[PDB]
Amino acid sequence: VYKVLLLGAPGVGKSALARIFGGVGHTYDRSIVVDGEEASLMVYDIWLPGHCMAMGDAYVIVYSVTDKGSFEKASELRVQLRRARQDVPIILVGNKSDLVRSREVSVDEGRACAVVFDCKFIETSAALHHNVQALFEGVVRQIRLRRDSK
Template sequence: MKIASYEDEATAYVLVYSIADKRSFRKACDQLQRLRDEENNTCPIILVGNKMDLARAREVSMHDGKIAASDFCSKFVETSATWKHNVDELLVGTLKQIRLYESAIEKAEQEAKASGKRKQKKKTRSHTSTYRSFRRATKRFFGRLTGKGEDAGVDRTCEDLYAPLPSKNY
């Protein structure tokens, strides 16, 4: 079934790919980009690398998954349904992300009511966020170029399913 039929009702998305299949990773990344490119789509998205038990057949590195999640302000986790590794963390983390998202929406609505202003449909990018985005992209580029650190250019919070999503800076 296509994701499009659920988009109006979704509170969060869990995009799963096989670590042993590069094509499934590309498809998940395409969906991730499509979801984030939609106007005002700030709901939680968790990118899940499944089949950790097939380590010898791995085609997608953990670092690639982290980079993709970090680039699109999403969360990342690797699981194994066979070993039941990180499955509980994924479910609890998804629920936590939904609760954080809903409380942020509620808080924004209360602030909008209190200030008497109507919520704008489309946000404009501030000078600070543009600078931050450029700085982050530059740091990621040089980190990859020089190979400094395995996680060069990765937002460290992408793996913390209990932390709020970073702000949308792309």
């Protein structure tokens, strides 16, 4: 049973993503099967930033691909985590991939941010439910790898 914190600037789709996962701040629970093994995830959509950051088994940092300011905020959030948790899995998410015409952050900028962070990167669309199940399965897989590389 794993606690997952959603972090990111206002308006990026944290609540959208969480409500889709929950099948529905606020909290969501849900058991899912990942590589043949059941896992429960508790998703905290609660973004006292220090307290929030002190608390997860994994961190999902969300920005909107339509909002370069939210992508900058993602880098700021990562620096903060580095100070707050001085091992934890982090997934970077570029949401709103359906809004092709208003895109402000390229896929390659997202990928580059992943290299700097040394973390996994995925783009999502809460509007289309695209990559939402993959995001949360990835969370589970990344937590397991870190339980086991020990």
